[PDB]
């Protein structure tokens, strides 16, 4: 129902260190991750979506079909594998990442001209907000 396509620049990033710590990311990697302001480059055609999380250190690329569970390879983040499902909850996207860590997933939605992302794991919540450049 909503087209997320766009190049979205980071405005807000709250509790990212704590989120990474809960994924057992080591001190050195967390240190460099502190230097980052990752952006989102999204291309969508209906339920087919590509979400590229772009940073000067490393990118993380998702390419999936909404509604279809898949094996997600989190190489570059925590190098884990999850059984992951992204679903439409109205105009919002809900992602559950089944695997080692409890409560791992995210929710993505647009409010006005802002892209909102809430990342979760083990009760930790990281809030990110992005905007296209007008
Ligand atoms: C570990 C340092 C690398 C950090 C650079 C990439 C940041 C990725 C953050 C975790 C994965 C984000 C998943 C994106 C989901 C979404 O945007 O809908």
From Swiss-Prot:
The lineage of its organism: Eukaryota, Metazoa, Chordata, Craniata, Vertebrata. PROSITE patterns: FABP. GO terms for cellular component: cytosol; lipid droplet; nucleoplasm; nucleus. Changing residue 108 to L: Strongly decreased affinity for retinol. Further decrease in for retinol. GO terms for molecular function: all-trans-retinol binding; fatty acid binding; retinal binding; retinoid binding. Changing residue 31 to A: No effect on retinol binding. Abolishes interaction with STA6 and the ability to enhance STA6-mediated vitamin A uptake. The keyword Lyase does not apply. Belongs to the calycin superfamily. Fatty-acid binding protein (FABP) family. This is Retinol-binding protein 1. All-trans-retinol binds at residues 40, 62, 108. One of its GO terms (biological process) is lipid homeostasis. Keywords: Cytoplasm, Lipid droplet, Methylation, Retinol-binding, Transport, Vitamin A. Changing residue 40 to L: Strongly decreased affinity for retinol. Further decrease in affinity for retinol. Its main location: cytoplasm.
């Amino acid at each position: 129902p909503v087209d997320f396509t766009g190049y979205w620049k980071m405005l807000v990033n709250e509790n990212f260190e704590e989120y990474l710590r809960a994924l057992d990311v080591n001190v050195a990697l967390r240190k460099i991750a502190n230097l980052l302001k990752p952006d989102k480059e999204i291309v969508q055609d209906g339920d087919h979506m590509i979400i590229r999380t772009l940073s000067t250190f490393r990118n993380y690329i998702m390419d999936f079909q909404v509604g279809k569970e898949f094996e997600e390879d989190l190489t570059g983040i925590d190098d884990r594998k999850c059984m992951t499902t992204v679903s439409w909850d109205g105009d919002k996207l809900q992602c559950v990442q089944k695997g080692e860590k409890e409560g791992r997933g995210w929710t993505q939605w647009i409010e006005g001209d802002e892209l909102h992302l809430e990342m979760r794991v083990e009760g930790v919540v990281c809030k990110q907000v992005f905007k296209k450049v007008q």
